[PDB]
Amino acid sequence: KGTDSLKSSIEKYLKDKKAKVGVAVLGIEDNFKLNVNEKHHYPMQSTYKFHLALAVLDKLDKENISIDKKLFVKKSELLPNTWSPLRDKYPDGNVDLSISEILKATVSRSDNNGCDILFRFVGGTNKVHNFISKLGVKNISIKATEEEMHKAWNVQYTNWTTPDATVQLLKKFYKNEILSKNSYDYLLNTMIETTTGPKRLKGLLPDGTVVAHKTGSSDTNDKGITAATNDIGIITLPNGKHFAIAVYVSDSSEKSDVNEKIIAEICKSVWDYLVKD
Numbered sequence: 001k002g003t004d005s006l007k008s009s010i011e012k013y014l015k016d017k018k019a020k021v022g023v024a025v026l027g028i029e030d031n032f033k034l035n036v037n038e039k040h041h042y043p044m045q046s047t048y049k050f051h052l053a054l055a056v057l058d059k060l061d062k063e064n065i066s067i068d069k070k071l072f073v074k075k076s077e078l079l080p081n082t083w084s085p086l087r088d089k090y091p092d093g094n095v096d097l098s099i100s101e102i103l104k105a106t107v108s109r110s111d112n113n114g115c116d117i118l119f120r121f122v123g124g125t126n127k128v129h130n131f132i133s134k135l136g137v138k139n140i141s142i143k144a145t146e147e148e149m150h151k152a153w154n155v156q157y158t159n160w161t162t163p164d165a166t167v168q169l170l171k172k173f174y175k176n177e178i179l180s181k182n183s184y185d186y187l188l189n190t191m192i193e194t195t196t197g198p199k200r201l202k203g204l205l206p207d208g209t210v211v212a213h214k215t216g217s218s219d220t221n222d223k224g225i226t227a228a229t230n231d232i233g234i235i236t237l238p239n240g241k242h243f244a245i246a247v248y249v250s251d252s253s254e255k256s257d258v259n260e261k262i263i264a265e266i267c268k269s270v271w272d273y274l275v276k277d
């Protein structure tokens with residue numbers, strides 16, 4: 001037992017769930033670790049917008065470009081029929097939008113068009129892949145823009161991660177090992193000031209728990225398979241410490257609300273273990 005009855009407890013919970021669920025927990029201040037179903041590749045869906053914002057913010061820090069500089073977005077780039085509050089605000093495109101505003105839409109509101117704008121800005125999906133790899137985090141594949149993921153069903157499975165790689169990226173980011181102080185502060189606040197995934201990592205946590213996170217979601221095909229239901233981020237414990245956590249519910253046959261409950265229950269049991277010192 002110890003941190004092992006916790007792993008065995010999560011495995012027991014996953015036994016009857018028709019899905020492949022990956023889990024990873026990394027203490028921030030204290031060196032706590034937990035893995036469930038780790039040697040597997042889970043599609044990231046919109047969670048990889050976190051990695052993109054990192055590459056964006058790093059490019060700004062390094063080239064000394066202000067997050068306030070404006071980018072001209074062509075109307076042809078605000079694609080329709082994809083989630084994009086940017087397009088809904090500026091339906092005619094051909095507009096100068098600050099990188100700050102585009103980041104906000106991409107991270108806090110999961111803007112697909114904002115995401116693809118920001119991929120163009122850093123030089124494409126492969127540039128983001130290199131940036132992550134050069135940080136010393138392995139087993140993250142970043143190959144498809146949001147536009148490419150909305151084509152064939154298979155294409156989302158080519159943006160994949162291990163759960164371990166995510167918590168490693170989260171904790172590097174949180175301990176301010178990646179970005180300038182101003183860039184760190186900005187991305188953190190956009191990950192706190194989100195309304196997404198209310199029933200995921202946050203669902204069963206006490207009221208007022210600080211949760212900086214990024215969700216991702218996919219469709220359900222006609223054999224009832226939801227490819228990806230995800231939530232990842234950093235959580236504050238009652239004693240003021242933090243832990244990074246990622247839950248990837250992949251290729252689920254379960255109903256949608258069950259898929260989020262899986263994230264919520266798993267995170268809740270981790271929350272209870274760590275709340276006991």
Ligand SMILES: O=C(O)[C@H]1/C(=C/CO)O[C@@H]2CC(=O)N21
Nearest residue numbers: 027028029030032241274277
């Ligand atoms: O001491 C604590 O507060 C928690 C914790 C939090 C993660 O930094 O990590 C260690 C493992 C555990 O229960 N401790």
Ligand SMILES: O=C(O)[C@H]1/C(=C\CO)O[C@@H]2CC(=O)N21
Nearest residue numbers: 073074075076077078093094
């Ligand atoms: O098709 C596109 O790429 C662009 C463009 C100019 C081409 O550089 O003009 C229109 C506005 C828009 O979205 N289109």
Ligand SMILES: O=C(O)c1nc(CCO)oc1CCO
Nearest residue numbers: 046083109110196215216217
């Ligand atoms: O727009 C959102 O709030 C959002 N959230 C997710 C992850 C699943 O909750 O994806 C999106 C964009 C469309 O999928």
Ligand SMILES: *C(=O)/C=C/NCC(O)CC=O
Nearest residue numbers: 045046149216217218219
């Ligand atoms: C952000 O999580 C992505 C949302 N939509 C992606 C798709 O619709 C692709 C699923 O087939």
Ligand SMILES: [Cl-]
Nearest residue numbers: 074076077120
């Ligand atoms: Cl273009």
Ligand SMILES: [Cl-]
Nearest residue numbers: 205206207208
């Ligand atoms: Cl409460």
Ligand code: NA
Nearest residue numbers: 046110215216
């Ligand atoms: Na999302």
